């Protein structure tokens, strides 16, 4: 068992000092209001997840009722509304091309829809099988390759055209529930119950780095725009930010009144902004460098489940459990 | 903006369909079945999960039958009733008791009532012999009373359990009616 001992000794050897001392020389972001400017209303039950398109104008959101709808955020009209074959969903995905939508959950079978059809209506273009656990994330990789994370302690990258699996990753001992894709679309980071965040390479299917900064679990995940760093949430009210080079935890956010779990995290183009949602009906906007509170974002009377900024970073959408979707700026 | 008006009309049609769907959804009540599960679902009627629709007394009920259940319970807050079925032929009985104790004390499953069901009474009577490993007894009626006594003791500590002896459709109907009546009474501060 000396391998882990020497690994941690080598890791601590390169960690001569933290970055807190040099971070004090930067100008604080100050207080930002970021009041709501739009409200998407019409959902029937609690919202589980939502996603933004590559055009940063349309978005897709699914609720507990059993239907997922696509809003046009600019003019508030609902572009699309599709009832799922089943009645349980957990996550949503918008393809970068904009012609496919992915979803999954308690059904344990992934569904891939085709928005741009010869007929006006849309149908289940592909039915994906091969998961023995509940789906958690279905982030799109390309028009034909999609990576998914389930509750069977393994994740899998599938090819839409052929139907069967292409790559499998079973490194995680616990059930992986968080999955984030890097902007380069080469490596993705996964997180499970056992306080473990692990890198995964699409081409090789062999994990590159492993992390154990958190304690309880990894129920939130995101990627830095730079691509060599990422931040993961936890039930311990902490969002530790790691890197792809030193494998050391950089930031540690603590606050005595939000001890509850953190559901989702996000970022911005500059990276000096971390939007994290909690169980106190608010999404505390945390500074990514000064490690202090920056925003409030108190506009929901129920628990926020999933939040995410747009591709251009011009707006922020927060999905809560009161069938209310709010756009912030 | 000629096509903007058509887009608004399409959105209005989608809103009308959503309103119809919301009326249908509010017309139905949702139940979560845990776990004799096959016999129970067969009686209710007359791959990973089972979703069932059944209408009785002009009231429509959805039924969802499903480590693993951490998130399943977590995202099932707004259910109306949780039916629990435990086999009395069983250890497995201790595991069921531990599961019930864990599920009863949840920080997010408050205000969700449960309905307890006891099955395989005939097999338990034929066996009578679980008293060897359970010395708290110190004939079949007394045995079943003893085996529900500690079950109720663990049950007690908003949500209320409804033990029953095993037809069941009317029992579920009455339990759901009582639960909704109590919820409405507490809404107006009458209970």
């Amino acid at each position: 068992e000396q391998l882990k001992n020497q690994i941690r000794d080598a890791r601590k050897a390169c960690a001569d000092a933290t970055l807190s001392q040099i971070t004090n020389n930067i100008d604080p972001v100050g207080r930002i209001q970021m009041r709501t400017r739009r409200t998407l209303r019409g959902h029937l039950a609690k919202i589980y997840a939502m996603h933004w398109g590559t055009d940063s104008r349309l978005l897709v959101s699914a609720s507990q009722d059993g239907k997922l709808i696509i809003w046009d955020s600019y003019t508030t009209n609902k572009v699309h509304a599709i009832p799922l074959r089943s009645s349980w969903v957990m996550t949503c995905a918008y393809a970068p091309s904009g012609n496919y939508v992915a979803c999954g959950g308690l059904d344990n079978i992934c569904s891939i829809y085709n928005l741009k059809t010869r007929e006006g209506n849309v149908r289940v273009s592909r039915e994906l099988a091969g998961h023995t656990g509940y789906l958690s994330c279905c982030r799109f990789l390309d028009d034909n390759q999609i990576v998914t994370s389930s509750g069977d302690t393994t994740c899998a990258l599938w090819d839409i055209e052929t139907g069967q699996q292409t790559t499998t990753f079973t490194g995680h001992t616990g059930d992986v529930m968080s999955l984030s894709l890097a902007p380069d679309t080469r490596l993705f980071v996964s997180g499970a119950c056992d306080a473990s965040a692990k890198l995964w390479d699409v081409r090789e299917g062999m994990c590159r780095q492993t992390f154990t900064g958190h304690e309880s679990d990894i129920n939130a995940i995101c990627f830095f725009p730079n691509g060599n760093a990422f931040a993961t949430g936890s039930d311990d009210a902490t969002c530790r930010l790691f890197d792809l080079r030193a494998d050391q935890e950089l930031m540690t956010y603590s606050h005595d009144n939000i001890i509850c779990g953190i559901t989702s995290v996000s970022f911005s183009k500059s990276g000096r902004l971390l939007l994290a949602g909690y169980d106190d009906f608010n999404c505390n906007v945390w500074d990514a460098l000064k490690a202090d509170r920056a925003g409030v974002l108190a506009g929901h009377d129920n628990r926020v489940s999933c939040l995410g900024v747009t591709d251009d970073g011009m707006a922020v959408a927060t999905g809560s459990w009161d069938s209310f979707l709010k756009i912030w700026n | 903006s000629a096509e903007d008006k058509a887009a608004v009309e399409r959105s209005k049609m989608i809103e009308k369909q959503i309103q119809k769907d919301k009326q249908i959804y509010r017309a139905t009540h949702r139940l979560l079945l845990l776990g004799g599960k096959n016999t129970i679902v067969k009686q209710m009627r007359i791959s990973g999960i089972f979703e069932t629709k059944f209408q009785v007394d002009k009231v429509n009920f959805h039924m969802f039958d499903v480590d693993e259940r951490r998130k399943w319970i977590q995202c099932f807050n707004d259910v109306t009733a949780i039916i629990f079925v435990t086999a009395c032929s069983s250890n497995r009985l201790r595991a069921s008791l531990k599961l019930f104790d864990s599920i009863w004390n949840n920080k997010w499953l408050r205000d969700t009532s449960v309905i307890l069901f006891l099955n395989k009474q005939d097999l338990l009577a034929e066996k009578i012999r679980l008293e060897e490993y359970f010395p708290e007894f110190a004939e079949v009626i007394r045995a079943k009373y003893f085996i529900r006594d500690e079950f109720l003791r663990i049950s007690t500590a908003k949500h209320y359990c409804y033990p029953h002896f095993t037809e069941n459709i009317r029992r579920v109907f009455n339990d759901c009616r009582d639960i909704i009546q109590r919820m409405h009474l507490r809404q107006y501060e009458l209970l």
């Epitope: 007929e119 006006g120 | 903006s1 000629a2 096509e3 058509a6 887009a7 009309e9 399409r10 209005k12």
Partner: single-chain antibody, 230 residues
Framework: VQLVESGGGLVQPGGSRKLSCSAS????????MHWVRQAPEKGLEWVAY????????YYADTVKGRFTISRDDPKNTLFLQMTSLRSEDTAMYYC??????????????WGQGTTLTVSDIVMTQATSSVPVTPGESVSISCRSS???????????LYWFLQRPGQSPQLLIY???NLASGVPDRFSGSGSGTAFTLTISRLEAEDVGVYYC?????????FGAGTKLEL
């Protein structure tokens, strides 16, 4: 998807005529529909339009009180009624579909068309017949009296190049986007008043007459068209 048109013939003037358009292959209930007319020696002229929900009904300015149009989703067939028709309607009618949402493709499919015989934005296509050579770039021009640029930023202009004998095929929609089935050699550009079509290479299928459509207001006036020969 298929569109079948029935009706027409030779009747006395000032009568009532029924035209039926049946759609087989797609759910036309959530589809706007348009009735257009084409004269034997002139271009197409917009007649009527019905929304998906049959809520708002619009009519051509030339004839308003002598036309009726309705649809029946369960019957999968829409009907058009002519009353007190004159002798000028010796035209062939096209029923077309159009779905309206963000990033949609209105007027995607055009019906076969059935023959029948007894203030507003206008376009002036100066060119009538310009011969072309194989493997040569072709430039077409459309001029609009009124600016087609809206506050949103999308110009509502469409191209409906008529093949010589069959129904029109949609080529460019909104002057910038690319249609589903069309060679990539076609390109469109403009500034708001003059719109240009550029063609790199042409073939036998490329032979046709190009039509110009505006969609900002609801005159729905067509252009003149340009003929090309090889």
């Amino acid at each position: 998807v298929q569109l079948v048109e029935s009706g027409g013939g030779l009747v006395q003037p000032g009568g009532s005529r029924k035209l039926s358009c049946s759609a087989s292959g797609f759910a036309f209930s959530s589809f706007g529909m348009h009735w257009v007319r084409q004269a034997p020696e002139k271009g197409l002229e917009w007649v009527a339009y019905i929304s998906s929900g049959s809520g708002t009904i619009y009519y051509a300015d030339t004839v308003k009180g002598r036309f009726t149009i309705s649809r029946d989703d369960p019957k999968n067939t829409l009907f058009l009624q002519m009353t007190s028709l004159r002798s000028e309607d010796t035209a062939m009618y096209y029923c077309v579909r159009s779905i309206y949402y963000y990033g949609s493709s209105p007027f995607d499919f055009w019906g076969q068309g059935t023959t029948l015989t007894v203030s507003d934005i206008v376009m002036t296509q100066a060119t009538s017949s310009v011969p072309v050579t194989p493997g040569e770039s072709v430039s077409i021009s459309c001029r609009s009296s009124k600016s087609l640029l809206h506050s949103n930023g999308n110009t509502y202009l469409y191209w409906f190049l008529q093949r010589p004998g069959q129904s029109p095929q949609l080529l460019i929609y909104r002057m910038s986007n690319l249609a589903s089935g069309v060679p990539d050699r076609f390109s469109g550009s403009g500034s708001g008043t003059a719109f240009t079509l550029t063609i790199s290479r042409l073939e036998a299928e490329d032979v046709g007459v190009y039509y110009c459509m505006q969609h900002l207001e609801y005159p729905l006036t067509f252009g003149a068209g340009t003929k090309l020969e090889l």
